[PDB]
Structure formats: structure tokens, C-alpha cells
């Protein structure tokens, strides 16, 4: 079950999306820039599974909506981007 996070562009979430954009830019040799999260949803798995929908600029500063699915286990300070794409 995926459920809505009520404060999705908070502190913690903007840092979860900035980490995925940095995972992405390093692995793709790309230059996306996070602007803002638009929505966050979550599923309980072996930890939590976050479906974040966000805006990033592509260098030309052109805005695009992306979606990252990141697996995180708080307790073992584990962050892992399972997917990243355009919506």
C-alpha cells in the first residue's frame, strides 16, 4: 500500500530527493538540479519505500517532473535509489 505523506517538501524529503539526483548525476554523467518535491508517497517494505514526484532543471535550466523511488532503512542509515525517471 502506498499512502500520501502530508508534508512532502520538508527538510528530510528534499534531502532524500537531492541524494537521488546526486546518485543520478554521478551514474549518468548528467547535470539535473533539484528545485522542489511535488508529492511523496510511501509503502512499508523492509523499511520504507518512497515515491517522490519532483521538479528538476536540466541544464539549460529547463524544468522537468521526475519520480524517484528510494528505499530507506533509517536505523541502518541505508539509502538506495531503486528507480528514477520522467513521469
UniProtKB/Swiss-Prot annotation:
Transmembrane segments: none
Entry comment describing in which tissues the protein is expressed: Expressed abundantly in tuber and leaf.
Renumbered ranges of motif Secondary area of contact: 43-47
Upregulating conditions: By wounding.
Domain Cystatin residues, every copy: 1-87
UniProt family annotation: Belongs to the cystatin family. Phytocystatin subfamily.
Function, as annotated: Probably has a role in the plant's defense system.
Protein name: Multicystatin
Shown segment, full-protein numbering: 100 to 186 of 756
